[PDB]
Amino acid sequence: LVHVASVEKGRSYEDFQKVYNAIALKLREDDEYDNYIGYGPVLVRLAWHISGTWDKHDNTGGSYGGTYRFKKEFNDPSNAGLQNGFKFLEPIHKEFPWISSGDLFSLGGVTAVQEMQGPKIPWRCGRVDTPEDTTPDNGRLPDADKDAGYVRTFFQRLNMNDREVVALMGAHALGKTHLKNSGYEGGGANNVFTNEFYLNLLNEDWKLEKNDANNEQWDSKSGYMMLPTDYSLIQDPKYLSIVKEYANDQDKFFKDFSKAFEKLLENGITFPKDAPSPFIFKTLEEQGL
Template sequence: MQAIRSPLRRVALQARLPVVRPRVARPFSTAPEAKSNTTLYLGIAAAVLAGGGYWAYTSSSDTAREVGTVAKSATQAAKAATNFVPSRADYQKVYNRIAETLDEAGEYDDGSYGPVLVRLAWHSSGTYDKETGTGGSNYATMRFEPEALHGANNGLNVARGIMEKIKQEFPWISYGDLWTLGGVAAIQEMQGPKIPWRPGRIDGFAKDATPDGRLPDATQGQDHLRKIFYRMGFNDQEIVALSGAHALGRCHTDRSGFEGPWTFSPTTFTHDYFKLLFDEKWVWRKWSGPKQLADKKTGTLMMLPTDYVLIQDKSFKKYAKAYADNQDLFFKDFSAAFARLLELGVPTAQFVSSEPWELKTLDEQKK
């Protein structure tokens, strides 16, 4: 590793490249950040190529992580300098690799990485604050501490590790595009609706990381849900639609403290989450963990306090009932809300397409 680092340092000194140092705090601004990132990436890309090595970092400090981000983006910048412009077909290849990875989970959870990839896409986007314009999927700041260690992100190191392997195969894609595309692929491959998506997110730095408390707290009620989702710009109908993502996956005591799946088919995207809310009798589970509900009939399913309020709050309930009665309506509304969630915090000018794409599933490509 020292042999790799030394040539890079010499080249950097000879080229008088800028040294990455902690920056003085300044107002949040996306456009200047994108410009300065590009200049820095191109400079360091030249040094990396000239030095014959790739900067690898091992320090856990924010500065080292920022250096690592710049270095990893060097490959992306170098390809751009040689007129490499990813096409829709290139993004379809990334989608396909993600889709193939879903079934490589083995004994992990219910045999699929799909639910945890949806959660990664959701949590990396749901930090957006419309008042300050901060957060969202643009900078993929969950790569940095302390955001990576926020309680709501427990266990997402698994998903980030999966995505890191794919990033090595396709180094030109940004983390924000990769993570959100992972959520799209997971939903679509688990028999969910098509999710319109388009690339254009850029990689940020540790200074762009969001404060804790921006993601939903499952122990809370309807007032908390509205505070979290209204901050992102969503309304009551969209809150309920997005909650339908709980059709997938399960909770873990070593992560959230809660335990169990929401549905009997946690790797298939359906409207069963809403049907079960109305069709089952839910009772408070008697155990040493946090407050959660269990279905009285089997005791194997669970609902969180934030789930249960969807049938207690009058406004939420009418949408939840509509989705319980009509899966097509749920799919349509979820697709629209989830697609918007994945674009929060990304300036429109950054997107490579004026209209989102609908990428094909693996099955569709076989026809």
């Protein structure tokens, strides 16, 4: 199964920078969402969940086909809450109806990371919408109640190694868990992209508690929250070494996250030899906007 990137007809860097800007201006405008976290975190989660259905063995799933727009996939229990991200992106899609759905969902994640002061994430266009029967079945996204060996095995399906897993998990600095979406609650209100997930794992006094949905989670007196899968990164000695590395080197963590996140959003896609180079979008702040 081969998915060849096909550039929206006649479009170039400037067209996609205009879409980036419209998403970034809306992120700034719609600041009240989720008790003033804003939409950045949910857009990052959306871009990960539309990409994380990929299976390297048969190239099913993945961001290319924009299949989250179909009911089977937007109703996946693992996607509960992401409808907020989709509704945020709807006026963007209306303004720029030429962008494919996979390009819009993945660019929403890139734009959110950068506007939250994260690394620059190179991004490539050319995902093409595919039909409803290409939508992957539910059940391909990971469970959060599991241990390190589950996480390691899970990510092998996405062709990610230990460093790529630990880097990608640093996005759990952002936003929060919501009991009604996932059965986990808490985590505060953070909307600045930093390496604080790793510092919190190493420095907080974690207690294993049960939440109001009767699921276990790790909580600190300070109000920080880790899922069992997050905590597994300090239980397994190979992950722990990488958590310490990122806790001690902000720049290394940004560069490794950028590479892993781009790879995640590009899994499954064949880029022709003469495809454009990846775009690196300017932030609103860099543009004086």
